[PDB]
Design a binder for this molecule. Structure first.
Ligand SMILES: OC[C@H]1O[C@H](O[C@H]2[C@H](O)[C@@H](O)[C@@H](O[C@H]3[C@H](O)[C@@H](O)[C@@H](O[C@H]4[C@H](O)[C@@H](O)[C@@H](O[C@H]5[C@H](O)[C@@H](O)[C@@H](O)O[C@@H]5CO)O[C@@H]4CO)O[C@@H]3CO)O[C@@H]2CO)[C@H](O)[C@@H](O)[C@@H]1O
Ligand SMILES: OC[C@H]1O[C@H](O[C@H]2[C@H](O)[C@@H](O)[C@@H](O[C@H]3[C@H](O)[C@@H](O)[C@@H](O[C@H]4[C@H](O)[C@@H](O)[C@@H](O[C@H]5[C@H](O)[C@@H](O)[C@@H](O)O[C@@H]5CO)O[C@@H]4CO)O[C@@H]3CO)O[C@@H]2CO)[C@H](O)[C@@H](O)[C@@H]1O
Ligand SMILES: *Cc1c(COP(=O)(O)O)cnc(C)c1O
Ligand SMILES: *Cc1c(COP(=O)(O)O)cnc(C)c1O
Lengths: 809, 809
């Protein structure tokens, strides 16, 4: 149908249909008369999967031959989403399969909706891991993603009475056609036990053993015939034992390690099961890495053949684990082992929020990982000796830099451990990386300035443009070709069409079609009722106080009160859409969701408002839902308090898909505004410096309450029970928090936010100019491609050169 | 190579090799340079599996068209063993695949050894279910086997220090290529809750729900293109919730239902988890049966379209469950529902041993299945009213026949429930069925004589002759053709070759080759050391006191003592092989195993004995091991105390494979001797009548101890520590039991057993005559084919006619 989806050859379509029927018959064991859409989805899935295997086997064979430096990306999260369409896109089979399925009397995009999301992540951090695997494969890097195969990913969110309800996400129920179990490569992982010191060295004994079974999933590069591997570990008990029965039933205890993903976004919870997950993935991955290395005995060349990237501190145990293996098993001397470890490891920091920092109680590590605690203490001692030698007499510095935090309960600061054992430490956006050097890690930056770098996040243009917005990818290709898909910088050529009347018409037309399609889905599923002509105001991301969905709520209420104030006055109609999940134990986040639905209950049924304002809460926000709502958005809400959102990635997705952005100078927003020009961005609120000055004199919410009539009115409505008639004090926690314990200064940005919002309503009533500004955003979003991000990691951290060279098909 | 394995067509072998390479590449995602024997086994497995699907789909389609009466075989056990070779045999692909694999440079029988046994059974009862499915498919019956998909079957047995060690049997570890998960047909099963009585009737509410997911495995008939289904249920928790995490982790509680097979052979253990398994399989199976029935509303025709066979009392809850559905859900009146239930259900009894009888505590049923207990009480009342009307004033009869046993703890006698709700009740061998009418169920037989029948057990000649003893199947085919394979009675034609010098030579040659092959395996695996010229004395079956492995032990010790008595005297050399598993909590059974290995420790290292006597304990006895040792046996030990072994099936396997039998007049042994002629059998010991007379005056083991010098000597050696130097009193329990609490009268049969054993040694030293007797056994073993057994069930119980009609390929 459209150019960017490849061609549908006669020979190709015919071969596809043949294999489709083969799988339906032999693989699914079904006939056309009993098959359901699900069966058809699977037949197609296995059909596409077949085209991957040849390339997968050749790619791995290629790496074995050339033996290039290997890149290992360790993460406890890989927010993959659906795999069917992304595979067709990267293999250029989309139109062929679409045709083939058409000829068999089936609607392909109906089948695509049947696929379950691989929701093995919480949000930003996990999606970044997913975009990275895609870019690394597209750039010909010999990379491997290593993680855990959770049988239950992020919970499915349901709203009952306006409240969030969590439901188990049983994504493996009907099977996963993309994975290949590899029981033959099962590895043992040890826990507990004790340490014995002999004349030969230290020995970790009397440990409990848990087996790690790997499952490999193919990661296809963009039309270069490269297929990398994502290896996920699953926990299994040894066959070798209350009673015979109970012993068999207690095997579940060991296998619970890979049972479910901890649903916390940017929040640390020191539970033992979580620590086990962290060590489990690290211990299994390193044995696999060393094994593959020995099949290419001095490890002096180890860092020339291996690079280990730590996605946050979650897999930080890789550092002492690597030392344990090199020292205890291979028997290299400490200093040699340490040198190799630092040259091999790199750490990526994702937030400066204190409650997200991993600090493990020493008594936990002591019981669960005896030898690792000893190694950590040893690392700390040698590290502190260096600090003392560089800053003689600075005793407070020693205490601040220690990997060990003193107090009622001793803890290990995993971030300090990562900095000490890595040759590189990077933030995820320029402003975030600076903040790391100026505040949180100032002492470390002073000792080893060379370790600190910046690597601004990015998103993959394949899934976030071609796959989810074919219409836009097409009209762009028409003007500048398809080369941009693997080189986003080329989108700048679109700057010459900003005054092109035809282009302006097409951009606006694609947006309109996307809105109509989403408006339909919103009514087809969830029986709702939006107006496709209104401005689509959307804020989708995990529910958090620092992300300030509450500030958005205050705007919505302000808009509503102004309409009731002057009903016959004209106002640009809007459809305000807020979506995202709240961690199960985050009370305030759960209240915010209930408040959003409560506002919707009042606003959406007030006859005076009509279809001028609607407040929709998007249920179960996930990768597949993001692919639908983002292309249909007009306005992207990125309003975190300056200094709190390390980078953000959702912001980039919206820029690439034609939405204008209203946000604070935080995270990557700064660089985005910088790339597109501040005039083409809706910036407002305090800058980082303003927040600091305010914390200086002390933030008093009362002040804003007394000086802003409209703000006062909103709080009073909340307190009196205007949005909760049957439970007048339902939102007392929210009001109390905003008035007395607001760590994120919501009130401080209210005035400028409302004014700025008026500025967007004004630009929207002039279609031509709004679209032209949109074109300036899309045209300058090239820098936010994860291909650019990965190319910088490769050259500045891993020491490998990216390659666009097509691999033999 | 051999005729009975089908032909290897040029076109066939070429197509097989092609698909083999296809699966290795696309299915296993491997290349010839990294593939292991396991990968090759799987490529071949998927290749053979492909040939089943076409027939499988057509067979099920055929049944949907003709809509014949359906047969449902409910069993908590299906001891299937390996599936690869059995599938090739029934599809006539053995030689083709053997050739195809040969040309690819692979040894096919090496690959067959890689397949894990599907050990979902304990012994006789479970294997019978397996032989039955095979026969029902071979006879064109629209039959379905229904059970539970245990993820852990019967434990793997290891011997440490002569003691049995149990190890989890993780048979699904590398995957099961034969099964097809059918998540789309998942059904809910209810537990707990309470009963509410409305004006509309009774309602079971506030129950806990557990989902039943089916897995279908194909059951191919013998070269008739019929492929039936065995549907096994797996327990799964509903997605709809201590904490979010704990709720997800507690899903394991519900899924534990199908986690492991209870390892008890002929022994009842009243655990709650077992009751759940029993109801789980019954509740899911009946909804499936009714659903399929409604897709052909009065159930008056239900018994014309459905037959439900209960394999023992394990699935006895099907009776009140069927009533519950018909009365509570469909709303038929009690009397109508009951009529339908009785006409639909049939019960097969497997033992008269009191400790094996299922008697569930009322307090258990009351908590777990509230409504079923009420229905059972109601059934009991109406039943007792009929007893009272037929035997007025016989108050003791009422108490003996009640489904409810009174006492400190009320219990429900499931066998009484089965008899009451079934139109047919059968024993598994003539003598066993008579015993049921004379003793255990005498009262029931008096009330409804028409319900009691006999259906002597049988074994499938496919797996137990063609598959495990190709050499013997071949020399037989040479003389009378291949028709016998699906009509064992034809083996009688072999009676005319009893004097044929050539045949006699071939029979003896096949036996010799089988012994050489087993002798090798015994040394290749387990590093042992037997003499292929000695007589192979074997007793393999579950370890039990009633099976009397102990009597065998006494013979072995007698033989040893006689050799040390007169070292230079000649004696027919023997290799005594005893094998079998003991239930984990059966102390005495564990001691018997230790005693066997202990005797081996003394006998196998006594230089004076030389290679004239060897005592081997066959480790981990299972279906695949039976396929190897049975064809190599010379003497089959079937020495249970008269009246205790309901039938036995191992005895038949040995008859069909060329071994002579030494046994008591018990179970099917009686009919076997009857078929072959008592002169061609080695019968000894007390008859049922003799055991009774002895219980009358009272069994005093002391008497035999005082009158038999050799017996006395053996007990003294045991007591003094002759077979346990480091632990002189190690076997005090055994001696004490034999002397004071022997329920099975071991001593009572010792003298006749030893004498009879001398008779076999005498016949063995005359090769020609021993072989001729062997030919008379093989020639008359036709009656013990499970095809004959199934044909009788079909005509005398289910009301359906068997068919040998080839189904279109
Ligand atoms: O094998 C070499 C080494 O072994 C032995 O030393 C080990 C210790 O026995 C063991 O406890 C561990 O030491 C840890 C210590 O337990 C831990 O608390 C931490 O101590 C740091 C503080 O974290 C740091 O703040 C600073 O403490 C200041 C404190 O802030 C300030 O308020 C005031 O109280 O002064 C304190 C000390 O000046 O420094 C301490 C000390 O570094 O970290 C320690 C090292 O990781 O590990 C040791 C080595 O493995 C033997 O005892 C030793 O002789 C051998 O050299
Ligand atoms: O709805 C119809 C019916 O409902 C109610 O009756 C029900 C009972 O309330 C309920 O308990 C249950 O009755 C069971 C009884 O609980 C159970 O113990 C059993 O009783 C049998 C004995 O098993 C049997 O041995 C025999 O008992 C003898 C005993 O051996 C002897 O030693 C001496 O003690 O005399 C005894 C009685 O003569 O008989 C009893 C009685 O049958 O079985 C009972 C029936 O299953 O279920 C009842 C019906 O569901 C109402 O109370 C009743 O009026 C209604 O007709
Ligand atoms: C990209 C994405 C995120 C991250 O969004 P931010 O606004 O940067 O927090 C979270 N969830 C999903 C499903 C995403 O696609
Ligand atoms: C046939 C068989 C049995 C039953 O043997 P009996 O001697 O009748 O108890 C038990 N186990 C296996 C593995 C069998 O093949």
């Amino acid at each position: 149908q459209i150019s960017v989806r490849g061609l549908a050859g006669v020979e190709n379509v015919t071969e596809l249909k043949k294999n489709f029927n083969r799988h339906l018959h032999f693989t699914l064991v079904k006939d056309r008369n009993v098959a359901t859409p699900r069966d058809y989805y699977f037949a197609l899935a296995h059909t596409v999967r077949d085209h991957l295997v040849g390339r997968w086997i050749r790619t791995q064979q290629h790496y074995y031959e050339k033996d290039p430096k290997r890149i290992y990306y360790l993460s406890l999260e890989f927010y993959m989403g659906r795999t069917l369409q992304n595979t067709m896109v990267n293999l250029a089979l989309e139109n062929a399969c679409d045709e083939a399925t058409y000829q068999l009397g089936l609607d392909m995009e109906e089948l695509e909706e049947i696929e379950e999301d691989a929701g093995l992540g919480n949000g930003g951090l996990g999606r970044l891991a997913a975009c990275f695997l895609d870019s690394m494969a597209t750039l010909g890097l010999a990379a491997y993603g290593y993680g855990i195969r959770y049988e239950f990913g992020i919970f499915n969110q349901k709203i009952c009475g306006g409240w969030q309800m969590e439901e188990a996400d049983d994504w493996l129920r009907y099977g996963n056609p993309w994975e290949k179990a590899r029981p033959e490569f099962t590895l043992p992982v040890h826990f507990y036990g004790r340490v014995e010191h002999t004349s030969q060295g230290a020995k970790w004994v009397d440990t409990q053993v848990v087996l790690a079974m790997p499952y490999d999933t193919p990661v296809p590069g963009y039309r270069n015939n490269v297929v990398n591997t994502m290896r996920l570990w699953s926990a299994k008990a040894p066959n070798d034992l209350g009673g015979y029965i109970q012993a068999v039933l207690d095997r579940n205890l060991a296998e619970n390690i890979s049972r479910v993903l901890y649903p916390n976004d940017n929040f640390f919870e020191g539970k033992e099961l979580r620590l086990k997950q962290e060590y489990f993935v690290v211990a299994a991955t390193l044995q696999d890495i060393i094994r593959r290395f020995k099949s290419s005995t001095n490890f002096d060349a180890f860092p020339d053949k291996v690079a280990i990237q730590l996605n946050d501190t979650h897999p930080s145990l890789a550092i002492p684990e690597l030392m344990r293996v090199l020292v205890d098993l291979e028997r290299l001397d400490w200093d040699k082992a340490w040198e190799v470890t630092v040259k091999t490891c790199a750490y990526t920091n994702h937030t400066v929020i204190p409650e997200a920092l991993e600090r493990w109680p020493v008594h936990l590590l002591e019981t669960l990982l005896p030898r690792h605690l000893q190694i950590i203490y040893e690392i700390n001692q040698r590290f502190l000796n260096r600090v003392a030698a560089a800053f003689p007499g600075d005793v407070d510095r020693l205490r601040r830099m220690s990997l060990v935090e003193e107090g009622a309960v001793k803890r290990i600061n995993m971030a300090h451990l990562c900095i000490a054992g890595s040759h590189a430490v990077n933030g995820v956006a320029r402003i975030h990386s600076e903040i790391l050097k100026k505040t949180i890690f100032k002492d470390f930056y002073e000792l080893e300035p060379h370790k600190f770098q910046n690597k601004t996040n990015g998103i993959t243009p394949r899934r976030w443009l071609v796959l989810c917005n074919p219409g836009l990818a097409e009209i762009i290709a028409e003007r500048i070709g398809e080369e941009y898909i693997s080189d986003l910088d080329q989108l700048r050529k679109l700057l010459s069409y900003v005054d092109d009347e035809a282009f302006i018409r097409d951009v606006a037309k694609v947006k309109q079609e996307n809105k109509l399609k989403f408006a339909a889905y919103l009514e087809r599923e969830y029986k709702v009722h939006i107006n496709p002509n209104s401005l689509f105001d959307v804020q989708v991301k995990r529910i958090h106080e620092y992300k300030r969905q509450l500030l958005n709520c205050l705007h919505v209420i302000t808009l509503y009160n102004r309409i009731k104030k002057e009903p016959n006055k004209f106002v640009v109609p809007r459809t305000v859409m807020i979506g995202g999940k709240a961690a199960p134990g985050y009370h305030m986040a759960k209240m915010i969701i209930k408040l959003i639905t409560a506002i919707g209950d009042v606003v959406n049924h007030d006859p005076v408002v009509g279809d001028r304002l609607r407040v929709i809460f998007l249920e179960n926000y996930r990768v597949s839902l993001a692919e639908k709502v983002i292309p249909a958005a007009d306005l992207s809400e990125q309003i975190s308090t300056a200094g709190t959102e390390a980078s953000g990635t959702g912001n980039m997705k919206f820029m690439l898909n034609g939405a204008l952005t209203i946000g604070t100078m935080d995270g990557a927003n700064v660089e985005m505004a910088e790339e597109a020009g501040e005039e083409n961005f809706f910036i407002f609120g305090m800058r980082v410096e303003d927040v600091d000055r305010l914390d200086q004199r002390g933030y008093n919410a009362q002040e804003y309450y007394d000086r802003i009539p409209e703000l006062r009115q909103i709080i009073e409505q909340l307190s009196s029970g205007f949005f909760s008639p049957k439970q007048p004090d339902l939102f007392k926690d929210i009001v109390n928090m905003l008035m007395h314990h607001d760590r994120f200064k919501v009130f401080a940005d209210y005035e400028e936010y409302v004014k700025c919002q008026e500025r967007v309503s004004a630009l929207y009533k002039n279609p031509r100019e709004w679209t032209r500004m949109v074109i300036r955003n899309i045209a300058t979003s090239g820098k936010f491609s994860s291909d650019r991000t990965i190319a910088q990691y490769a050259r500045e951290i891993w020491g490998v050169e990216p390659s666009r060279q097509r691999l033999p098909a």
